[PDB]
Amino acid sequence: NECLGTIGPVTPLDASDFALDIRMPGVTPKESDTYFCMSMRLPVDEEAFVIDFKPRASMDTVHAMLLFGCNMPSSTGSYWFCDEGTCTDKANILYAWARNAPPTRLPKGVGFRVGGETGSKYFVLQVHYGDISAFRDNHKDCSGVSVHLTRVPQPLIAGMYLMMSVDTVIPPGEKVVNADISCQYKMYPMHVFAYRVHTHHLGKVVSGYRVRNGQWTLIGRQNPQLPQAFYPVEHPVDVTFGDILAARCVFTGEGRTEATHIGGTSSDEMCNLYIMYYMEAKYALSFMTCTKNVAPDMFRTIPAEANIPI
Ligand SMILES: [Cu+2]
Numbered sequence: 174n175e176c177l178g179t180i181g182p183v184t185p186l187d188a189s190d191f192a193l194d195i196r197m198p199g200v201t202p203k204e205s206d207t208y209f210c211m212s213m214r215l216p217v218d219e220e221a222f223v224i225d226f227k228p229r230a231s232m233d234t235v236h237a238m239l240l241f242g243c244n245m246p247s248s249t250g251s252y253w254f255c256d257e258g259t260c261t262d263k264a265n266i267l268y269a270w271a272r273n274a275p276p277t278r279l280p281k282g283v284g285f286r287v288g289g290e291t292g293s294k295y296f297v298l299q300v301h302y303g304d305i306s307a308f309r310d311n312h313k314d315c316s317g318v319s320v321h322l323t324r325v326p327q328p329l330i331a332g333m334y335l336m337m338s339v340d341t342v343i344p345p346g347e348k349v350v351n352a353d354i355s356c357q358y359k360m361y362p363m364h365v366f367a368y369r370v371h372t373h374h375l376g377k378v379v380s381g382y383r384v385r386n387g388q389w390t391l392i393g394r395q396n397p398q399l400p401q402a403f404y405p406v407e408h409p410v411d412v413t414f415g416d417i418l419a420a421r422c423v424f425t426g427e428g429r430t431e432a433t434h435i436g437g438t439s440s441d442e443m444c445n446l447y448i449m450y451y452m453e454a455k456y457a458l459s460f461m462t463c464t465k466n467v468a469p470d471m472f473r474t475i476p477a478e479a480n481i482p483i
């Protein structure tokens with residue numbers, strides 16, 4: 174079932190363009206909710222641009238998939254469990270496939286720059302397998318993602334503005350805990366075209382806004398318990414020098430004996446909001462982070478919807 178062997182992962186389209194198949198190397202899981210990770214080096218050492226993703230997911234088994242970019246994977250193995258870790262350095266997300274939430278295409282002219290001196294040398298593919306019902310026959314699985322690379326330089330460059338809580342603590346029982354993140358945007362204009370939220374099972378609602386002279390332009394709002402793909406932004410949102418990116422995850426503490434804090438495990442929590450943007454080639458940077466809350470009181474003027482779960 175859909176597994177190349179003798180043809181390999183690389184597939185020339187044209188001189189410049191080519192397609193690359195990041196697949197699992199015939200793994201079979203033992204247990205449910207298993208996170209498998211494997212890496213692919215880039216075939217070229219020159220800078221390239223990623224411009225498309227086709228999900229190749231066997232529908233009767235794969236919960237979700239993620240693709241990152243980094244310079245140093247965690248394992249040197251053929252595959253590994255992602256609890257060991259994805260990338261030792263900063264792992265940069267590019268694509269998120271979710272079952273039951275069809276992903277959107279990248280806008281035309283937009284590509285993530287990869288490789289070269291500065292960009293990512295590796296891809297790491299994280300596959301989340303749900304149930305084991307279809308593996309009764311013990312068949313090796315080759316699920317993954319074909320990607321479209323090219324050396325033709327693209328007019329617009331994709332990047333990611335990661336907003337995350339670092340020092341949150343949820344007291345057990347506590348009915349409502351907000352996790353507020355805010356930073357002054359400090360670069361050339363970006364335009365936001367997608368977003369993903371990630372929390373674990375206590376996340377009620379994550380929301381993120383651009384605030385320009387006091388008024389709260391919404392970017393994205395989602396219940397993290399819904400499938401965590403990138404979702405499209407209604408009308409693309411520019412974000413200019415001086416603007417403030419605010420975001421608020423909202424957590425409950427109920428159904429918990431001890432206090433929850435930020436971390437990797439299932440017992441711990443996360444408040445990540447990934448805002449995919451594009452910038453003009455000449456002005457572009459590929460990654461931005463915000464772990465602060467530089468404008469804390471400002472969250473009184475927050476919209477209501479941010480605190481209203483659905
Ligand atoms: Cu997490």
Ligand code: NI
Nearest residue numbers: 364409410411
């Ligand atoms: Ni605009």
